[PDB]
Amino acid sequence: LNILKTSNSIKLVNLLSIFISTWLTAAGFIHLVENSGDPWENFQNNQALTYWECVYLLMVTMSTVGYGDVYAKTTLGRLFMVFFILGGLAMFASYVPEIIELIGNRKKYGGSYSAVSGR
Amino acid sequence: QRMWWAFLASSMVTFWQTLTGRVLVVLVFALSIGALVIYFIDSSNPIESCQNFYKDFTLQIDMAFNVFFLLYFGLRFIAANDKLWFWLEVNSVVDFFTVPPVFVSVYLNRSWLGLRFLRALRLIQFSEILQFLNILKTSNSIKLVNLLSIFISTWLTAAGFIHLVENSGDPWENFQNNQALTYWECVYLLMVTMSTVGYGDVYAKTTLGRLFMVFFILGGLAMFASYVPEIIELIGNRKKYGGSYSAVSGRKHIVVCGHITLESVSNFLKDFLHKDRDDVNVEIVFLHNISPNLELEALFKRHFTQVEFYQGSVLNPHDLARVKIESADACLILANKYCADPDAEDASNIMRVISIKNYHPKIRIITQML
């Protein structure tokens, strides 16, 4: 649908669509698994979670910040934390970002000359 | 109460190089420094407080700063030229969002600390003028100063914003859930975020604060990983041997120049500083363009009290004046003996000899020759 084709579109495709999709599906995944509770323990530890703090928990879990404010309170939740770390940290370390660092800045002198009349 | 249609309207969200410019920009960041200092001073005070026109004596200096910022605002009108890019300018936007809100707060005769610290962007201005003030006339050093200036600028701005969101609270929850911590505490937390250590002893209680700092720490890690690779090496690529030679009265010295290499200088030192000599009391100095190798600094360190090194060329009379060959007893020239064309080294040594004799025609020269 007539996007701005200056490699910005392709960098959008290969970075931010997949980043947002994975982040949002992981947030919804932890929300479901935490609100479900423990199956064999009759769902006694079903922690009440909102989506804002869920996605905040994802972003705290990735990168390196080890905030003790929020964490997984159940065994399968901690399982899924481990899998999410093993996937997302490896991705954010060696697959996605190098593209955005090799994007760099835009062109320095790509403009034209304005013919000012009288000179 | 809690009015915003006047502060935002003041923020204006809609939209009769020379010394003349130098004086005004110096005044601009000097008053920015003063206002940021007094903001840090009264940061412990609550955001909202009453203030009469003749009550706060400290705020009178703030009003002098405010009318001077209004003068700079009129200067911005004068230098606007193109109005579209004038309101597109980021510094102009910051001034729009900080000075008219101060005017409205003073008209209302009440204190409001919201977005008052935004002048920290102007703290990067003195880096350019430090070159004018001939403290640092180089390029790498002024680039490092500018980079640390923008680092500390985004530091103080982010610390202030996190502090205000922290002590404000949720507006839809009657802002009664706000935590209580000081500017030093928010500084500590923002180290906690930027450093990615993540202590978690004290966090951002506000939900909107968390939803801000999430993409803020994304941007911060991006800019950190972008900028440190051109920060770390600056301490490495700095000239060390650019100084001159300090003569010692009553003790002579000689000058060794030409092609100097590890094995050549090793042999020369080993047969010149031999222990079986009656008395050696001459300093040995070196002149060359290519920086010495780590083994050569190792030799210089193990002979720290006998040999000194300097970087320069024998064809530069300024370099010869720096080495001070007037008091030198003699000059030595080492010639490469392994290159393809022998006549090239002969001609090079001839140029060295004529330059040295032209600078001083009454010294002793001993040279190799192929």
- CA-to-CA distance for B115 and B39, rounded, in angstroms? 11
What six digits make up the tokens of A52? Answer: 């804002």
Q: At what angle do helices B262-272 and B294-302 cross, to 10 degrees?
A: 10
- CA-to-CA distance for B126 and B129, rounded, in angstroms? 5
- CA-to-CA distance for B186 and B105, rounded, in angstroms? 25
Decide if B200 and A55 are in contact by the 8 Å CB cutoff.
no
Q: How far is A43 from chain B (nearest CA, A)?
A: 27
Quick check: helix, strand or coil at residue A90? Answer: helix
Instruction: Name the experimental technique.
Output: cryo-EM
Amino acid at B309: F
Name every residue whose Cβ is closer than 8 Å to that of residue B351 and which is 6 or more positions away in sequence.
B314, B315
Contact (CB, 8 A) for B326 and B319? no
Q: Give the sign of the dihedral formed by CA B163, CA B164, CA B170, CA B174.
A: positive
- CA-to-CA distance for B43 and B272, rounded, in angstroms? 68
Contact (CB, 8 A) for B111 and B105? yes
What six digits make up the tokens of A105? Answer: 């800045």
Q: How far is A68 from chain B (nearest CA, A)?
A: 5
Q: Give the sign of the dihedral formed by CA B181, CA B165, CA B162, CA B117.
A: negative
- State the DSSP code for A17: I
Contact (CB, 8 A) for B198 and A67? yes
In chain A, residues with a C-beta closer than 8 Å to the C-beta of B226 are 101
In chain A, residues with a C-beta closer than 8 Å to the C-beta of B207 are 52-53
Count of alpha carbons within 13 angstroms of residue B150, beta-carbon side: 11
Chain B interface mutation, best of A20, A65, A105, highest count of B Cβ atoms under 10 Å: A65
- CA-to-CA distance for B241 and B309, rounded, in angstroms? 7
Contact (CB, 8 A) for B280 and B303? no
List Cα–Cα distances, B293 to B32, B95, B263, B299, in angstroms. Answer: 47, 52, 12, 10
Minimum-distance CB partner of A63 among B201, B207, B221? B221
Quick check: helix, strand or coil at residue A43? Answer: coil
Q: Which helix (H) or strand (E) holds A33?
A: helix A18-36
Q: Give the sign of the dihedral formed by CA B192, CA B198, CA B204, CA B209.
A: positive
| Residue with tokens 């920086």, as numbered in its chain | B291
* Count of other CB atoms within 10 angstroms of residue B298: 12
Decide if A63 and B192 are in contact by the 8 Å CB cutoff.
no
Q: Which helix (H) or strand (E) holds A21?
A: helix A18-36
Contact (CB, 8 A) for B267 and B299? no
Contact (CB, 8 A) for B245 and B310? yes
Decide if B198 and A69 are in contact by the 8 Å CB cutoff.
no
What six digits make up the tokens of B219? Answer: 């941007």
What six digits make up the tokens of B73? Answer: 């605002």
Minimum-distance CB partner of B203 among A63, A64, A67? A67
Q: What is the dihedral of CA B315, B319, B323, B325, to 10 degrees?
A: 40
Minimum-distance CB partner of B203 among A63, A69, A101? A69
Contact (CB, 8 A) for B114 and B47? yes
- CA-to-CA distance for A68 and A61, rounded, in angstroms? 11
Contact (CB, 8 A) for B281 and B251? yes
Resolution (A): 3.3
Contact (CB, 8 A) for A49 and A31? yes
Residue B311 assigned as binding residue: no
Residue B128 assigned as binding residue: no
List Cα–Cα distances, B15 to A105, B21, B77, B97, in angstroms. Answer: 28, 27, 14, 12
Contact (CB, 8 A) for A55 and A27? yes
Decide if A64 and B193 are in contact by the 8 Å CB cutoff.
no
Looking at the DSSP bridge assignments, the partners of residue B331 are B255, B365
- CA-to-CA distance for A107 and A6, rounded, in angstroms? 11
- State the DSSP code for A112: -
Give chain B as a 3 state SS string: CCCCCCHHHHHCCCCCCCHHHHHHHHHHHHHHHHHHHHHHHHHHCCCCEECCCCCCHHHHHHHHHHHHHHHHHHHHHHCCCCHHHHHHCHHHHHHHHHHHHHHHHHHHCEECCCCCHHHHHHHHCHHHHHHHCCCCCCCHHHHHHHHHHHHHHHHHHHHHHHHHHHHHCCHHHCCCCCCCCCHHHHHHHHHHHHCCCCCCCCCCCCHHHHHHHHHHHHHHHHHHHHHHHHCHHHHCCCCCCCCCCCCCCCCCEEEEEECCCHHHHHHHHHHHCCCCCCCCCCEEEEEECCCCCHHHHHHHHHCCCCEEEEECCCCCHHHHHHHCCCCCCEEEEECCCCCCCHHHHHHHHHHHHHHHHHHCCCCEEEECCC
List Cα–Cα distances, B222 to A67, B50, B104, B162, B334, in angstroms. Answer: 20, 42, 37, 19, 52
| Residue with tokens 């997984």, as numbered in its chain | A72
Gaps in chain B (C to N distance exceeding 2.5 A) after: 15, 16
List Cα–Cα distances, B239 to B45, B242, B257, B292, B304, in angstroms. Answer: 48, 6, 20, 12, 19
Residue B185 assigned as binding residue: no
What six digits make up the tokens of B57? Answer: 């004596």
What six digits make up the tokens of B336? Answer: 């490469």
CA-nearest of B148, B168, B162, B165 to B191 is: B162
Count of alpha carbons within 13 angstroms of residue B50, beta-carbon side: 2
Decide if A59 and B218 are in contact by the 8 Å CB cutoff.
yes
Count of alpha carbons within 13 angstroms of residue B326, beta-carbon side: 9
CA-nearest of B186, B184, B152 to B166 is: B186
CA-nearest of B307, B327, B323 to B315 is: B323
Burial status of residue B355 (CB atoms within 10 A of its CB: 0-12, 13-18, 19 or more): middle
Contact (CB, 8 A) for B297 and B265? no
* Count of other CB atoms within 10 angstroms of residue B34: 15
Decide if A67 and B200 are in contact by the 8 Å CB cutoff.
yes
Contact (CB, 8 A) for B323 and B284? no
- CA-to-CA distance for B349 and B367, rounded, in angstroms? 8
CA nearest B223 in A: which residue?
A101
CA nearest A101 in B: which residue?
B226
Contact (CB, 8 A) for B214 and B190? no
- CA-to-CA distance for B144 and B186, rounded, in angstroms? 26
Name every residue whose Cβ is closer than 8 Å to that of residue B56 and which is 6 or more positions away in sequence.
none
Decide if A56 and B210 are in contact by the 8 Å CB cutoff.
yes
